[PDB]
Each structure stands twice: as C-alpha cells, then as structure tokens.
Amino acid sequence: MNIFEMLRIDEGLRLKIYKDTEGYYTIGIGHLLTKSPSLNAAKSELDKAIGRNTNGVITKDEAEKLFNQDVDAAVRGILRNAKLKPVYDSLDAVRRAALINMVFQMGETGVAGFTNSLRMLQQKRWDEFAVNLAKSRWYNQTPNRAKRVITTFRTGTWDAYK
Ligand SMILES: [Cl-]
C-alpha cells in the first residue's frame, strides 16, 4: 500500500468533469480544475492541463499523468515548506503518506496552518493530535475520509485502508 493506492481510494476516478462536495469543477483523481462556476472556464483549464482539446473528458492515462504530477507537487510542496519539512522529516513512512494525503487535499498552506496539531505530531503524541484534528472544518466536512487519514497518523499502519 502506498500513497498512490491511498489517495486513489480516497479520491476515486472520474473521466469526466465533475463537481466535488465543495461544488468545484474537478476531474480524474481529485484533480482540481477551478473554483469558478463556469464549466467553460473549467473546460479551458482542463485543456491547458491536458494539452489538447478535451471537450470535458479525459482518458485513464491522462488522469494518471495529472495524478503523478499532483502527488509530486505535494511532495515538493512539503519539502519546500518551512513548517512542513521537519515534521515530515520526523515521521516514519506510513505517516508521511498521511501528511502527503492532506497536503494533496488542502495545500501546503492549508495544512501548514494546523500549527497546533503539527507540534503534537512532532511530539509523536498520536492520540491527542488526533483529537485535535477532529475539531476541524476538514473533519466535519468529510468525516470518513478524514477518519482514515487520522487513523493512519494515529497508528502509523494502513488498517483504515484495508
Ligand atoms: Cl495541470
């Protein structure tokens, strides 16, 4: 099991534009198009991203390319984040995945603003960071997913995904 497997599951796969839970144009494996409410606008960005005239739909492979880049970008954003790095650098492998999953979902910045839960993760105080992350808009907006992620951080295992 690894980050790729993890997020594919957490995000699913769509070949067609779709709207998320926040109601945003999205595609593939949680690949955010635009926050704007113009399907057109979303079509353009999709085109720009795929590099061809898509007319709203991509292929699996296309989806997969966006995804690999999306995971790469998340990794680099972590490594480049002054708040994120050390955290990341201090966790074992399962947990870095979890850190990566959240960054994928909210952005360096977003994730970087959980400064209290970050310390805790730093102290390796699983149980409490966990309680802490739960008091998040994030946890209530999408509790099941949020729970897997948080369990993964807590335990440092993949049980939530098996
Ligand atoms: Cl792109």
UniProtKB/Swiss-Prot annotation:
Q: Which residues bind substrate?
A: L32, F104, S117, N132
Similarity comment:
Belongs to the glycosyl hydrolase 24 family.
What is the designated name of this protein? Endolysin
The record describes the protein's role as: Endolysin with lysozyme activity that degrades host peptidoglycans and participates with the holin and spanin proteins in the sequential events which lead to the programmed host cell lysis releasing the mature viral particles. Once the holin has permeabilized the host cell membrane, the endolysin can reach the periplasm and break down the peptidoglycan layer.
Q: Which GO terms describe its molecular function?
A: lysozyme activity
Effect after changing E11Q: Complete loss of activity
Q: Which organism is it from?
A: Enterobacteria phage T4 (Bacteriophage T4)
Q: What induces its synthesis?
A: Expressed late in the viral replication.
